[model samples]
Target: SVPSQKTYQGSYGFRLGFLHSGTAKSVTCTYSPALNKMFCQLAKTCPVQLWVDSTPPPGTRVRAMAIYKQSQHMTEVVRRCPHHERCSDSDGLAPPQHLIRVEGNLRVEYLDDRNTFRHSVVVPYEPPEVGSDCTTIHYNYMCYSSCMGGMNRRPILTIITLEDSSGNLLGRNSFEVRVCACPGRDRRTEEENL
Candidate 1:
């Protein structure tokens, strides 16, 4: 059976942050050892009404579960392979065996229907322990915001982490795209309508 929709009153918003590690600085080029520690944060503000309805709808809850499941899978893979081993064929023709390492935390704060903010800490593992190679780590986050009357919005954030074998953090960046029925449009005076 389909779940019923629940109505929630009031406006709210949220903030989120995360840390990054294991990023690389460079590849074969002789420059520096490696850079491997960084962080990222995303902020957004929306109306209150949007937060309650659009945040994490009943049907969408399954997607959230999938994210958690993938994280667990990665954790298990890490536990099984504590030592750095090359998983690719090492030859002058084939590509090098370089897998990046990644770890982080996500935080969310709801302000209202239309406005919200997020922050996170991410770590990138540069260069697989084997030798010289490149590894990219992808991350994601989501939140909801609400405002006066019947206004609100939901935003999703995507992040990428890059690192090299030297155990250096190369790139730790985040991008947030908002998803909601009422975007920039506001309905403040309609507070009584609700």
Candidate 2:
């Protein structure tokens, strides 16, 4: 059973248990002497994994959302233990991750000959750096931040939500990732450039 999630628009809580999308196998994080906490390690290029079963609950679309890492809003996360099953990790700390939006000069014209140029600055989402990054990546992030300290302090969790046409949630599941530094990166033998 997962701990009570932080934010689900107060619509759905931990109802259907954890999503099968986050069954990442053989993950083992080592102790971090710097922060007194542990972190799982992965290559910088290898983004986390998220997958769902083929069948849906009918009349619903599944959406993946990463729990924002910065700014504490409702609950705590990453309460790690030595064992994987024993670890107390869940979503809803800051808020649900949103799409990257930009102010665009949107314009519409009836005909090219009339030359009636009209436009408005509107906030719109660009082609999302998605698929292993946005829908799975959640909010945009930088390498280092003001609070995360270093590479080991980062936390990544994505929630898969099933919603119906009426804007009501159908089902929910939480996906937690064990992202960390890549193995054998420190001693690259002969050529560290690679």
Candidate 3:
């Protein structure tokens, strides 16, 4: 059993239980502080060995395990900007403009359902830098007018992964960016008179 309302600061947890129909007169479990390995005894005769680490040991039947880490905070965002305008147009129609900016305190792992390992930004942090807290990161992405629709709107999804100093996975968070279509004030004005 694990402790309630308390995080497991250690690497992992261990539990002793039976797998089949067998009864041991006595069961004892102990951890080696010098080697970080757990040892158990069954009926004072059978000895079982267990390793304490992120990954499970080979040939070991795992029942339960826990890892202590932080959770990521990613928020959904939507921004609108005016489309470009051309003077040669007789109808005074504005050119489509599609530009977006994304900023946050996280590392961009994937953007718009595409892997951006080669173009994404990564924010580095040390425990002592932020008083043992997670570091703040800022990132931005801009899209061209061709990426958006003329009448309908589209959305982009971003996924981020959080980690600690040891390179262990803390958690994952995601957010969405809905790109809206540009306004047609001229079309609305013509319809109002009719």
Candidate 4:
């Protein structure tokens, strides 16, 4: 039950997942992708895992509210199915046998840091290259644009898709690796000529 318009990056539609300390208005939480649990509302007595510190430092705006709790150990997700009937045989098919089997109390909570409203819990571990293909050895970026008065062109890679537990589609991953900017420098004229 997560789709009011799905807005959980910064906060607008709502999806910050319990990160309290002040200034970041948005509520309505409770995501259980099969025990990947996530209950919201931080700052009443906060204490589910720990980490509630925010007061306007993360993309500032002003809404402030604190009450935290968290957990998110997605159990190193892994999936593959379509091998039934006595392990299939004779070209019947038999592969895909890992639809998640590593229980360890999952949890989730966002707003990692800001002013200081504190709220934290994250057991979401999917480290094995996070989605597969060794995720370019866990994202590298050709050694940061091969350096040399060049860096931050943006767009080397950032594909992160790992969903399961009824949501299906478990695979596809990448993360921050865009470095190829220094030739003419664009990113707003290299941040307004620094």
| lDDT winner | 2
Candidate 3 Cα misplacement greater than 4 A, ranges? 1-119, 126-134, 144-153, 164-168, 179-194
Q: Would you list the rank order by TM-score, best first?
A: 2, 3, 1, 4
Q: Write the per-residue lDDT of candidate 1 for residues 60-177, one digit (tens) a residue.
A: 1100010111322222111101121233322222112111111221221111112211122233222223432222233221121231111123222233322233423333333333
> Candidate 2 versus the native: TM-score?
0.30
lDDT of 2 by residue, 137-193 (tens): 222222221123222344545454555645356555554433434322211221234
**Where does candidate 1 stray beyond 4 Å?**
1-118, 128-134, 142-151, 154-174, 179-194
Q: Candidate 3 residues 8-82, lDDT tens each?
A: 323333222111212222323232332222222211111222222243222222111111111221121222223
Query: What's the lDDT for candidate 1?
Result: 0.21
Alpha-carbon runs more than 4 Å astray in model 2: 1-59, 68-156, 183-194
Cα displacement (angstroms), candidate 3, residue 95, comes to 27
As for lDDT, the candidate ahead, 1 or 3, is 3
> TM-score for every candidate vs. truth?
0.19, 0.30, 0.26, 0.18
lDDT of 4: 0.23
Q: Output the number of the TM-score-best candidate.
A: 2
**Higher-ranked by lDDT: 1 or 4:** 4
Candidate ranking (lDDT, best to worst):
2, 3, 4, 1
* Whole-structure CA lDDT of model 3: 0.26
